[PDB]
Amino acid sequence: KTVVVTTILESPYVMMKKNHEMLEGNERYEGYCVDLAAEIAKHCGFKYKLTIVGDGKYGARDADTKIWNGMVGELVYGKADIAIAPLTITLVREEVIDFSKPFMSLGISIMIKKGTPIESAEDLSKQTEIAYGTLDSGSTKEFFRRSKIAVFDKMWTYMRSAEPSVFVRTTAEGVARVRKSKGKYAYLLESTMNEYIEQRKPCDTMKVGGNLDSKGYGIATPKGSSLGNAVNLAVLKLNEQGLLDKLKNKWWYDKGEC
Numbered sequence: 001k002t003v004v005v006t007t008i009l010e011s012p013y014v015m016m017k018k019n020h021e022m023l024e025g026n027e028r029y030e031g032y033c034v035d036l037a038a039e040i041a042k043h044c045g046f047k048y049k050l051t052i053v054g055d056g057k058y059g060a061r062d063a064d065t066k067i068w069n070g071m072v073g074e075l076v077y078g079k080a081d082i083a084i085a086p087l088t089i090t091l092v093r094e095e096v097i098d099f100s101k102p103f104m105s106l107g108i109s110i111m112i113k114k115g116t117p118i119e120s121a122e123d124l125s126k127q128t129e130i131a132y133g134t135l136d137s138g139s140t141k142e143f144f145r146r147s148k149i150a151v152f153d154k155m156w157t158y159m160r161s162a163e164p165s166v167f168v169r170t171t172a173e174g175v176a177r178v179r180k181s182k183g184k185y186a187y188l189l190e191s192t193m194n195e196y197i198e199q200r201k202p203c204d205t206m207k208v209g210g211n212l213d214s215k216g217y218g219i220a221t222p223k224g225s226s227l228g229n230a231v232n233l234a235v236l237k238l239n240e241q242g243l244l245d246k247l248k249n250k251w252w253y254d255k256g257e258c
């Protein structure tokens with residue numbers, strides 16, 4: 001009866017409260033998705049339990065075993081009843097799980113250390129001094145793996161063979177790499193996360209160029225779940241009322257430190 005929510009520790013969507021050790025259950029977390037989960041649950045009339053995805057991944061299907069990992073996997077195999085996180089709506093995922101209409105719009109973008117002589121994806125593709133990569137088991141990596149677009153095709157050709165690996169396990173790892181590489185590493189990540197980090201000390205990174213694509217994050221449920229319909233209506237109601245915009249301002253800019 002209590003709905004099991006799978007989510008991921010990704011700032012500012014879900015973060016551990018400073019005093020989480022003295023708190024219980026859902027109260028241990030804070031963030032955009034924590035606030036949204038409470039609202040979705042309230043509007044859909046269900047009790048829930050926030051759980052962090054075991055493998056800390058978003059969701060990809062292994063080409064060899066064909067098994068789904070990450071939050072998608074937890075939904076596919078029945079470990080969670082719903083995923084409320086910055087989970088990108090994609091065709092391959094839509095084929096195995098259901099997604100609500102987008103609660104956030106975004107696109108792949110470029111994050112550089114301030115001062116890096118890069119202004120676009122084309123710029124990155126035409127040079128070799130500056131390395132660049134993406135997150136693992138995510139929609140961004142898949143975007144490049146599948147792109148038939150010349151520029152992105154070139155970029156994938158480079159990234160998949162670059163040594164040492166230009167891929168990272170978590171967004172935080174990618175951000176740290178940019179900050180410590182003296183401008184020799186640029187990170188490809190969704191505009192949402194890029195924009196957030198841009199407003200965080202040490203204020204040494206910035207988003208450059210236009211988004212490479214346009215898509216959205218959706219609340220996901222197991223294929224054919226009974227919660228799907230209500231969850232989708234709730235997302236639309238909250239967006240139409242202005243809550244989603246308020247929540248983004250709250251976690252991105254209201255407490256911006258740059």
Ligand SMILES: N[C@@H](CCC(=O)O)C(=O)O
Nearest residue numbers: 058086087088138139140
């Ligand atoms: N939002 C992405 C993860 C982040 C990324 O791939 O850049 C996903 O659902 O896979």
Ligand SMILES: [Zn+2]
Nearest residue numbers: 016018020021
């Ligand atoms: Zn802790």
Ligand SMILES: [Zn+2]
Nearest residue numbers: 039042043238
């Ligand atoms: Zn409400």
